[PDB]
Design an enzyme around this catalytic site. Structure first.
Site, mmCIF file in Angstrom:
data_model
loop_
_atom_site.group_PDB
_atom_site.id
_atom_site.type_symbol
_atom_site.label_atom_id
_atom_site.label_comp_id
_atom_site.label_asym_id
_atom_site.label_seq_id
_atom_site.Cartn_x
_atom_site.Cartn_y
_atom_site.Cartn_z
ATOM 1 N N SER A 279 5.448 1.863 -0.114
ATOM 2 C CA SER A 279 6.843 1.915 0.329
ATOM 3 C C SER A 279 7.481 3.241 -0.055
ATOM 4 O O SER A 279 7.010 3.929 -0.968
ATOM 5 C CB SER A 279 7.700 0.702 -0.120
ATOM 6 O OG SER A 279 7.533 0.377 -1.485
ATOM 7 N N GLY A 280 8.533 3.593 0.681
ATOM 8 C CA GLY A 280 9.266 4.841 0.517
ATOM 9 C C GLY A 280 10.460 4.799 1.458
ATOM 10 O O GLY A 280 10.840 3.712 1.928
ATOM 11 N N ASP B 92 4.013 15.736 15.462
ATOM 12 C CA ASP B 92 3.966 15.613 13.981
ATOM 13 C C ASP B 92 2.520 15.540 13.441
ATOM 14 O O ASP B 92 2.182 14.722 12.553
ATOM 15 C CB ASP B 92 4.787 14.423 13.471
ATOM 16 C CG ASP B 92 5.036 14.467 11.937
ATOM 17 O OD1 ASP B 92 4.634 15.420 11.259
ATOM 18 O OD2 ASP B 92 5.630 13.529 11.368
ATOM 19 N N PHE C 28 11.025 5.665 4.796
ATOM 20 C CA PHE C 28 10.572 4.952 6.016
ATOM 21 C C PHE C 28 10.518 3.410 5.878
ATOM 22 O O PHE C 28 10.859 2.696 6.815
ATOM 23 C CB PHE C 28 9.188 5.497 6.500
ATOM 24 C CG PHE C 28 8.033 5.182 5.550
ATOM 25 C CD1 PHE C 28 7.332 3.966 5.646
ATOM 26 C CD2 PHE C 28 7.674 6.083 4.531
ATOM 27 C CE1 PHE C 28 6.299 3.653 4.740
ATOM 28 C CE2 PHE C 28 6.641 5.782 3.633
ATOM 29 C CZ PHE C 28 5.950 4.565 3.743
ATOM 30 N N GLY C 29 10.089 2.902 4.724
ATOM 31 C CA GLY C 29 9.907 1.464 4.567
ATOM 32 C C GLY C 29 8.722 1.072 3.715
ATOM 33 O O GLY C 29 8.393 1.756 2.754
ATOM 34 N N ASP D 135 0.820 8.022 12.891
ATOM 35 C CA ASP D 135 2.234 8.355 12.860
ATOM 36 C C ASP D 135 2.707 8.973 14.162
ATOM 37 O O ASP D 135 2.689 10.202 14.358
ATOM 38 C CB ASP D 135 2.592 9.214 11.657
ATOM 39 C CG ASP D 135 4.040 9.036 11.247
ATOM 40 O OD1 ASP D 135 4.928 9.462 12.023
ATOM 41 O OD2 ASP D 135 4.280 8.445 10.156
ATOM 42 N N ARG E 234 -1.311 14.676 6.705
ATOM 43 C CA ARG E 234 -0.718 13.427 6.120
ATOM 44 C C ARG E 234 -0.738 12.298 7.195
ATOM 45 O O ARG E 234 -0.826 11.116 6.872
ATOM 46 C CB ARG E 234 0.703 13.639 5.562
ATOM 47 C CG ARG E 234 1.716 13.817 6.661
ATOM 48 C CD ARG E 234 3.112 14.114 6.142
ATOM 49 N NE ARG E 234 3.426 15.503 6.416
ATOM 50 C CZ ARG E 234 3.895 15.964 7.575
ATOM 51 N NH1 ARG E 234 4.150 15.112 8.565
ATOM 52 N NH2 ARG E 234 4.119 17.271 7.743
ATOM 53 N N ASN E 235 -0.712 12.701 8.459
ATOM 54 C CA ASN E 235 -0.699 11.792 9.571
ATOM 55 C C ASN E 235 -2.067 11.510 10.226
ATOM 56 O O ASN E 235 -2.134 11.117 11.385
ATOM 57 C CB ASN E 235 0.305 12.339 10.585
ATOM 58 C CG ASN E 235 1.744 12.179 10.089
ATOM 59 O OD1 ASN E 235 2.011 11.343 9.195
ATOM 60 N ND2 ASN E 235 2.666 12.974 10.640
ATOM 61 N N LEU F 54 0.860 -1.161 0.000
ATOM 62 C CA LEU F 54 0.000 0.000 0.000
ATOM 63 C C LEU F 54 0.907 1.226 0.000
ATOM 64 O O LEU F 54 0.469 2.354 -0.221
ATOM 65 C CB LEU F 54 -0.864 0.017 1.255
ATOM 66 C CG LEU F 54 -1.995 -0.967 1.518
ATOM 67 C CD1 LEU F 54 -2.502 -0.752 2.951
ATOM 68 C CD2 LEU F 54 -3.131 -0.811 0.516
HETATM 69 C C1 LIG Z 1 1.352 10.053 4.049
HETATM 70 N N1 LIG Z 1 0.995 9.203 5.221
HETATM 71 C C2 LIG Z 1 1.541 7.819 5.124
HETATM 72 C C3 LIG Z 1 0.719 6.847 4.212
HETATM 73 C C4 LIG Z 1 0.925 5.409 4.771
HETATM 74 O O1 LIG Z 1 2.151 5.077 5.278
HETATM 75 C C5 LIG Z 1 2.240 5.737 6.584
HETATM 76 C C6 LIG Z 1 3.716 5.829 7.027
HETATM 77 C C7 LIG Z 1 1.688 7.230 6.548
HETATM 78 O O2 LIG Z 1 0.428 7.457 7.223
HETATM 79 C C8 LIG Z 1 0.726 7.919 8.537
HETATM 80 N N2 LIG Z 1 1.407 4.901 7.560
HETATM 81 C C9 LIG Z 1 1.734 4.731 8.873
HETATM 82 C C10 LIG Z 1 2.805 5.215 9.682
HETATM 83 C C11 LIG Z 1 2.877 4.886 11.048
HETATM 84 C C12 LIG Z 1 1.892 4.070 11.619
HETATM 85 C C13 LIG Z 1 0.824 3.593 10.839
HETATM 86 C C14 LIG Z 1 0.736 3.914 9.466
HETATM 87 C C15 LIG Z 1 -0.193 3.597 8.448
HETATM 88 C C16 LIG Z 1 -1.397 2.847 8.369
HETATM 89 C C17 LIG Z 1 -2.148 2.699 7.176
HETATM 90 C C18 LIG Z 1 -1.678 3.350 6.004
HETATM 91 C C19 LIG Z 1 -2.089 3.484 4.663
HETATM 92 C C20 LIG Z 1 -1.139 4.284 4.000
HETATM 93 N N3 LIG Z 1 -0.177 4.635 4.899
HETATM 94 C C21 LIG Z 1 -0.480 4.095 6.092
HETATM 95 C C22 LIG Z 1 0.262 4.231 7.294
HETATM 96 C C23 LIG Z 1 -1.252 4.649 2.502
HETATM 97 C C24 LIG Z 1 -2.699 4.465 2.003
HETATM 98 C C25 LIG Z 1 -3.314 3.105 2.426
HETATM 99 C C26 LIG Z 1 -3.330 2.882 3.969
HETATM 100 C C27 LIG Z 1 -3.276 1.914 7.502
HETATM 101 O O3 LIG Z 1 -4.193 1.582 6.739
HETATM 102 N N4 LIG Z 1 -3.299 1.593 8.807
HETATM 103 C C28 LIG Z 1 -2.107 2.101 9.489
#
Ligand SMILES: CN[C@@H]1C[C@H]2O[C@@](C)([C@@H]1OC)n1c3ccccc3c3c4c(c5c6c(n2c5c31)CCCC6)C(=O)N=C4
Length: 300
Positions: free
Chosen positions: A24-25, A141, A27-28, A159, A145-146, A22
């Site tokens: 990667s970048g 933060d 962060f991972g 986040d 976006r978060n 869903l």
């Molecule tokens: C732009 N912000 C990112 C999009 C994304 O990567 C991130 C790192 C960011 O968002 C906080 N991230 C997380 C970072 C830290 C904890 C949890 C998440 C996270 C979750 C989910 C994410 C999804 C997407 N990110 C999800 C999630 C991208 C779209 C599909 C769902 C999800 O469904 N439950 C948890």
């Protein structure tokens, strides 16, 4: 002071089937997935986070910090940690937020987002944050976006990558150096690297602005070095078109220089709540498998 009795749950890798990336970048990577505990006869949509592959003992210390923070929060407006998985590569398992990130949701849907939604989100985030404040937690933060979207009617703060638990009544958090989102930050933060609940309010302010402008970039252009001088100058972000002076005046208060002059999250809940009872008065918008269970219904 109070002992933290949160439970950290260790999950088996064979209890969850991945399904697709869903995101990667840097962060991972993040996966859509299903968690099918023991014989329990439930399937739970989950997102599985893996801080890249690179098993540098730096990357496991950080993901373990997030898990620490996320395991210590329980609130309808804060993202749910299900547990961690102790494979070579350490995985965070959180609740799936199908509709994705709120910033992309506003960009992708302007022509369909009404005032009722914008104001409800504002209330929900304010609740999440008020609750983090109760748990003496400083997000550091907060930005659109978060915040993720579980359903369009239900958003959750996420986040916690930079969050800090304030130890023994230690009013403010003094930070190290390191990369920090400048455009969402209180001023006393950019200058002195102080972080307070009140400095979270500021970013709440910018978060709301991102929502009301439908996902625009704060100070689009101005590079980060100027931002501090620009704000000492007394410059702020412009009133969005859809915004009544009532709404924008609340933004502006989040952006005062005197941190204690800004509103408390409990007050933002109230104000946005009143506004949410008559949305069109405050925001002016043209046109205005079988055993699946959500994490929020899966308690233990
Ligand atoms: C732009 N912000 C990112 C999009 C994304 O990567 C991130 C790192 C960011 O968002 C906080 N991230 C997380 C970072 C830290 C904890 C949890 C998440 C996270 C979750 C989910 C994410 C999804 C997407 N990110 C999800 C999630 C991208 C779209 C599909 C769902 C999800 O469904 N439950 C948890």
């Amino acid at each position: 002071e109070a002992p933290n009795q949160a439970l950290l749950r260790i999950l088996k890798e064979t209890e969850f089937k991945k399904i697709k990336v869903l995101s990667s970048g840097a962060f991972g990577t993040v996966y859509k997935g299903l968690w099918i505990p023991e014989g329990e006869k439930v399937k739970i949509p989950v997102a599985i986070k893996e801080l890249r592959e690179a098993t540098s003992p730096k990357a496991n210390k950080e993901i373990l910090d997030e898990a620490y923070v996320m395991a210590s929060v329980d609130n309808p407006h804060v993202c749910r940690l299900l547990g961690i998985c102790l494979t070579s590569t350490v995985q965070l398992i959180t609740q799936l937020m199908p509709f994705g990130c709120l910033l992309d949701y506003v960009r992708e849907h302007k022509d369909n987002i009404g005032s009722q939604y914008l104001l409800n989100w504002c209330v929900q985030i304010a609740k999440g944050m008020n609750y983090l404040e109760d748990r003496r937690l400083v997000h550091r933060d907060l930005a659109a976006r978060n915040v993720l979207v579980k359903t369009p009617q239900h958003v959750k703060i996420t986040d916690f990558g930079l969050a800090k638990l304030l130890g023994a009544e230690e009013k403010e958090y003094h930070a190290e150096g390191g990369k920090v989102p400048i455009k969402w930050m209180a001023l006393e933060s950019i200058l002195h690297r102080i972080y307070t609940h009140q400095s979270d309010v500021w970013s709440y302010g910018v978060t709301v602005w991102e929502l009301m402008t439908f996902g625009s970039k704060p100070y689009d252009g101005i590079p980060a070095s100027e931002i501090s001088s620009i704000l000492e100058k007394g410059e702020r972000l412009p009133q969005p078109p859809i915004c009544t002076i009532d709404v924008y005046m609340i933004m502006v208060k989040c952006w005062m220089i005197d941190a204690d002059s800004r509103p408390k999250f409990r007050e933002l809940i109230i104000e946005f709540s009143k506004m949410a009872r008559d949305p069109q008065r405050y925001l002016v918008i043209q046109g205005d498998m079988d055993d699946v269970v959500d994490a929020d219904e899966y308690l233990i």
